[PDB]
């Protein structure tokens, strides 16, 4: 009690977040893309409804908050994130960072540049709306590149003067994680202000104890991503593991097994809308995962439960985790 | 008298538009930025004051319309450009296409998907403003790129469908305007229609009268980016030719003398803000040309006029030209 998280609908009780999933996105788009071409989504209407469906589907499933880690590049839209809010009745972080699209005006800016524009987001709000961002979201695309590591910087810079967390986009080894962690530690940043994200891209478990042995956050995030019979669909093909989403669970329960469970994070990824990608690449992952982002609570959890994961554990890394992760510190 | 172009205020008469700046900017910046970061030019209101006082500058000299190339991707904001052309008296035509920093919405898209997104802008109004686009810009850097192809493409079918024009942007030598005409006519667009721009990068005359024979509209179109005294200074040196300035205005007249006097257009590509570069080059740029968008009209016609161009040739370059160009065809 006490502490507060801001969320899209204005500040809430840390302790009212419960169950939340730390890396999702309402629609994963570009900058400014909604606003200049919203019938690529049918319309803004049929996207907000698409959304509200959705989130009221994952409230049902027990889920009460999302972290919606869509970045300026990622074309967040944080009056899109309240309006679904308020009608699914889902609280919503948003974030600032940057994710592998910057523009032109953002590749040219210096570190002290993106430190005071993450930092505007978070204490002053986002765009002329008031609304804060409560998590900064960066990315690595394999080896930093120079931009990428002053991102990195600037968002390791507004976590020390904000204490709001840090969280990242990893590629699949690399394992890019560790450049990461090594850069937030030059800047004097606590790993424990930190997950490194897609961690499930791989079963390196020597990799991933590492990590959450210096107290980072591994971010177990992509948890539906699994399919077969996508052979024949180049673009499905590259989004969808055929490695079973049982051994995405599996994964977590291996963390546990190592005493690791105070360092995990577990979300899907998933999305309403995807504008940077494929043309019509929504039809294909709803087929895929119709459960959308209930998909954890209805069929991750009981898994766990059912292999003999404690549910006082699987309540520990759904709700204590992501609250502690998200307070201010 | 009769044809009608869009500005950002509405329709006006053809013949109302008089002498035009064909490829200007009121600001170069990226899509979202200038709505998620407004204090980087200061404010917005002190960029808008800056436009105001650049744009009735340009008025007072004689300038009456100017075409702002700025796509969705250069940030274009056609709420500031409406602003803008309302405070100075000067019309403005807003532009769709793409340039050469598309986000991953824009560089996933199909032909006929980006021919929608063009067309949209154009008949239908930028974002939810009703605003329609009064010409098409698209840019290729030297070989025109996959993506860049498809643009180019959507640009020809978008200019078929509607009439407007279509202006372009070209690196200097590839020499890039033939390999853009190519396509163009590739998809029956009458050259009348199209610009091929920056075409005062190089003075190959032979590249030049070649396209102007053809029907192409030449855009002579970076008229004060002279400068000396530059070299302890990299950026700003990227920018300004050691070419006087009197030396791009001799290709206007030499095109004259070879008796292309109705395939020219000549322009500034100025701005009053500039994010998509390095920070604070509007202080550089300003101090080499603090007339603005007026130094056409007060040192390159006079200059011509005094080198013997009639005067009535020099109205028809200004105003004549400009007029058949935008006049929907
Ligand atoms: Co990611
Ligand atoms: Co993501
Ligand atoms: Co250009
Ligand atoms: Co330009």
Redesign the interface.
């Known amino acids: 009690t006490g502490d507060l998280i801001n969320t899209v609908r204005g500040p809430i009780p840390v302790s009212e977040a419960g169950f939340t999933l730390t890396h999702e996105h309402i629609c994963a788009?570009?900058?400014?893309?909604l606003?200049?071409?919203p019938?690529?989504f049918g319309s803004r209407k049929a996207l907000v409804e698409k959304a509200v469906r959705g989130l009221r589907h994952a409230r049902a499933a027990g889920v009460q908050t999302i972290v919606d880690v869509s970045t300026?590049?990622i074309?967040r839209d944080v009056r899109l994130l309240a309006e679904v809010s308020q009608a699914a009745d889902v609280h919503i972080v948003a974030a600032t960072g940057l994710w592998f699209?910057p523009?032109?005006?953002?590749r040219?800016?210096?570190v002290e540049?993106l430190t005071?524009?993450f930092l505007?987001?978070i204490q002053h709000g986002?765009?002329?709306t008031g609304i804060r961002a409560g998590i900064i979201k960066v990315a690595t695309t394999g080896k930093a590149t120079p931009f990428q590591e002053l991102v990195l910087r600037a968002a390791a810079r507004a976590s020390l003067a904000t204490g709001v967390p840090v969280t990242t986009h990893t590629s699949a080894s690399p394992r890019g994680g560790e450049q990461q962690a090594a850069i937030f530690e030059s800047e004097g940043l606590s790993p424990s202000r930190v997950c490194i994200g897609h961690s499930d891209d791989t079963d390196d478990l020597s990799y991933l104890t590492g990590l959450a042995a210096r107290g980072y956050l591994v971010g177990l995030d992509r948890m539906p991503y699994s399919a077969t019979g996508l052979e024949g669909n180049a673009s499905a093909l590259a989004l969808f593991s055929t490695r079973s989403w049982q051994t995405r669970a599996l994964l977590i329960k291996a963390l546990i097994d190592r005493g690791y469970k105070d360092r995990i994070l577990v979300s899907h990824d998933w999305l309403f809308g995807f504008?940077?990608?494929?043309?019509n690449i929504m039809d294909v992952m709803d087929r895929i995962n119709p459960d959308g982002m209930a998909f954890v609570p209805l069929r991750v959890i009981p898994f766990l439960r059912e292999k003999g994961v404690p549910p006082e554990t699987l309540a520990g890394v759904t709700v204590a985790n992501p609250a502690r992760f998200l307070s201010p510190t």
Chains 1, 2 share one sequence.
């Open positions: 788009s570009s900058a400014g893309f606003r200049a071409w019938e690529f300026f590049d074309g699209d523009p032109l005006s953002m040219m800016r210096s540049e005071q524009f505007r987001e986002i765009e002329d504008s940077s990608y494929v043309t």
